[PDB]
C-alpha cells in the first residue's frame, strides 16, 4: 500500500540562447500537476491537486518555483560557460524530485540526469555526484554548494514540505485513488514468427487501478507459455494490457482468457476461443489486412 510522489522536470538547452523547461507531477500513476514552459503559473490537472494547502500558502510555494525556473535556466547556462571547451550544446537536463509515503514515515529524493545518464543527487545538505559519475562535474558541484540559500531552501522542501504536502494529497484525492473501473476484454490472433504457429491475443482495456491478472487457461491449467505484455495508458487514465499465447495451428480450441481484477469483485472475465460470442465479435472487426505488421 505504498505511494510515490514524483515531480519531473525536463530542461532543454539547444544553444547559448534557446531554452525551454516543462514539468509534470505524478501521484503514483495519476498526474496532479502540469507546468508548461509556455505557462506562467502551475496548472492543476485534478480538482484536488492543491492538497490541503490554502491559497495564501500555495501562492508562496508557486512563487518559490517561479523564481527557481528562471534562475535554473540562467544557472546552467553559466555553468556551460564555465566548462566552455569541455562541454557544449545541445544539453538535456532532467530532474526527478519527490518523496515516497509509508505509518507517518517517508523518504525523500532529488535525482538529476545529464544527457540521459543520472549523475547528481541531493543528499542531506549538499549536491553530490554519484559513484561512476564523470569527474568534470566536480567544479560545478563546488560552485552550486557555495549557494547556502538554495541548499537551505531545498532541505526544507525535501525534509518537511514534500511529506507534509503529500499526506494532504492522499486525503484530498482519497476518492479518486480508490476508484474502481471495469476492464473490457476481447480476442484476436496473428501469425507467429514461427512457421505453422499462431499467436493468440487477449486485449484487456480500461481497468483501474493498474494491478491486474491475465492468463490463458486450459480448464484448471494456466498455460505457462502466457506472455503478459506491458501496461499501455488510455486518455482517461485507465490501463490497457494484452496477454499473448503461442499455439500450433489447430490447437486454439478449449483455451480461454481469464481476467481477474479488484473491480470485478470475484466474478472473473472468461473469454472462450470459439465461443458464439468470440465468433460474433471477430465478424464485427474484419478488414483488408493491410498494412498489417510483418
Amino acid at each position, epitope marked *: 500500500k505504498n505511494y510515490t510522489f514524483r515531480c519531473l522536470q525536463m530542461s532543454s538547452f539547444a544553444n547559448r540562447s534557446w531554452s525551454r523547461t516543462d514539468s509534470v507531477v505524478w501521484l503514483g500513476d495519476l498526474q496532479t500537476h502540469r507546468w508548461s514552459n509556455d505557462s506562467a503559473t502551475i496548472s492543476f490537472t485534478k480538482p484536488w491537486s492543491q492538497g490541503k494547502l490554502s491559497n495564501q500558502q500555495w501562492e508562496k510555494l508557486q512563487h518559490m518555483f517561479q*523564481v527557481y525556473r*528562471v*534562475s535554473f535556466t*540562467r*544557472d546552467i547556462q*553559466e*555553468l556551460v*560557460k*564555465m566548462m*566552455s*571547451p569541455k562541454e557544449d550544446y545541445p544539453i538535456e537536463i532532467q530532474l526527478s524530485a519527490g518523496c515516497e509515503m509509508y505509518g507517518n514515515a517517508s523518504e525523500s529524493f532529488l535525482h538529476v540526469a545529464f544527457q540521459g545518464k543520472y549523475v547528481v543527487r541531493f543528499w542531506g545538505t549538499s549536491w553530490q555526484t554519484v559513484p561512476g559519475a564523470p569527474s568534470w562535474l566536480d567544479l560545478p558541484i563546488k*560552485v*552550486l554548494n*557555495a*549557494d*547556502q*540559500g*538554495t541548499s537551505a531552501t531545498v532541505q526544507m522542501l525535501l525534509n518537511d514540505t514534500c511529506p507534509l504536502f503529500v499526506r494532504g494529497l492522499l486525503e484530498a484525492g482519497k476518492s479518486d485513488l480508490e476508484k474502481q473501473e471495469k476492464p473490457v476484454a476481447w480476442l484476436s490472433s496473428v501469425p507467429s514468427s514461427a512457421h505453422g504457429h499462431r499467436q493468440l491475443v487477449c486485449h484487456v482495456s480500461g481497468f483501474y487501478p493498474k494491478p491486474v491478472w491475465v492468463m490463458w487457461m486450459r480448464g484448471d491449467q494456466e498455460q505457462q507459455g502466457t506472455h503478459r505484455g506491458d501496461f499501455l495508458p488510455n486518455a482517461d487514465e485507465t490501463w490497457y494490457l494484452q496477454a499473448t499465447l503461442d499455439v500450433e495451428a489447430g490447437e486454439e480450441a478449449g483455451l480461454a482468457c481469464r481476467v481477474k481484477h479488484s473491480s470485478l469483485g470475484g466474478q472473473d472475465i472468461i473469454l472462450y476461443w470459439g465461443s458464439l460470442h468470440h465468433i460474433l465479435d471477430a465478424q464485427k472487426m474484419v478488414w483488408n489486412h493491410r498494412h498489417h505488421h510483418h
Partner: T-cell receptor
Amino acid sequence: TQVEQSPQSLVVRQGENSVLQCNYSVTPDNHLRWFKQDTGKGLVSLTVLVDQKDKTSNGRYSATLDKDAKHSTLHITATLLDDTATYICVVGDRGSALGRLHFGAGTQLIVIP
Amino acid sequence: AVTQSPRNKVAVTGGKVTLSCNQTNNHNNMYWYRQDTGHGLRLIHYSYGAGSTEKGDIPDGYKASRPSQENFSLILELATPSQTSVYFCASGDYAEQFFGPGTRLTVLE
C-alpha cells in the same frame, strides 16, 4: 534601472545623522551590499545584508534590509568630514559565483563643516 | 588588492587601447565594469578562469581577453568618443567582489 537610490545627493552638517535610501526590483534578491566610493578611487564594501529582514552595524555605519518591501536604509551616525563620498547600493541575485551584481546610481554625500 | 594600469589615458578615435588588470588574490572570476554619471556600474566582459571570456551586458566596441589567472585585459580595437568613461576592474572567488582603483579614459575626436 533595477536598483534606485534616494536622494540624488545629500548635504549634512558635520556630526549629525545621515540617512540613505535604496529601492530595488531585482529578482531573486539574495543579498544587498553598500559601498563607499571616495572621489577619485575604487569601491570599498561597508556592510552586507542577507536575511529576509536583516540589520547590520559596522562602527558608525548601520544598515537595514526589508526583502518584503525590497528596501534598504544606510545610517551614518555622527558624520565626519572624511565621509564625503558616493555611497552605492548593490543587490546580488545569487549566493554563489554564478551571480550578477546590480548597481544603483549612488547617493553623493557632502558634509558641510 | 587588485591593481590596474594605466590610471589615466588620453586616446583618439580609431585607436587601439588596452587596459590591464592584475590581482594576486588568487581569484577565478574577473569582471570589467564602466562607470558613467546617472547610471551606476555596468558589466562589459567577465571571465570564469584562464582562457575564458564572456560578453557582459554592454560588450559592443570592447574585446576582453584573459591570458592567465592573475591578469585580465580589456581591449578597444577602434576607439569611440562615446567610450570616454571610468573603468573599474573586479575579482572574486558569500560572493564578495573586490574592486580596482579604476582607469579614467578620455577618447577624443
